[PDB]
Design a protein around this ligand. Structure first.
Ligand SMILES: Cc1noc(N)c1C
Length: 119
């Protein structure tokens, strides 16, 4: 029933994501010099360094807000791909499966703890 435990759990999950070779395209903001019409297609850029900085600054209140920003990394990649068979989009689908597998217990434990706090 620890209401604060999600934050270190998310720190540890982000460390595992940075070690994954599949995170390479997503570790820093998309480079506009490489992809000059990126902002014609994507309204809200997001990347894993921005998620980690937001967590370490104390600017997430819950693991649901961190999960919304990580899901936006993967939705942006789907929207910007020219094909469902592309290399950067194929790395985004494997990394999304790994993330969803690990975030599920973090969300459940936090939501259970808040329900106990409010009982
Ligand atoms: C850049 C970039 N971001 O996502 C994809 N799918 C590409 C290409």
């Amino acid at each position: 029933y620890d209401i604060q435990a999600w934050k270190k759990q998310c720190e540890e999950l982000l460390n595992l994501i940075f070690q994954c070779e599949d995170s390479e395209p997503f570790r820093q903001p998309v480079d506009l010099l490489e992809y000059p019409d990126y902002r014609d297609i994507i309204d809200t850029p997001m990347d894993f360094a921005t998620v980690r900085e937001t967590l370490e600054a104390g600017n997430y209140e819950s693991p649901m807000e961190l999960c919304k920003d990580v899901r936006l990394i993967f939705s942006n990649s789907k929207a910007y791909t020219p094909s469902k068979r592309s290399r950067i989009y194929s790395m985004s689908l494997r990394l999304s499966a790994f993330f969803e597998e690990h975030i599920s217990s973090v969300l459940s434990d936090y939501k259970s703890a808040l329900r106990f706090h409010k009982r």
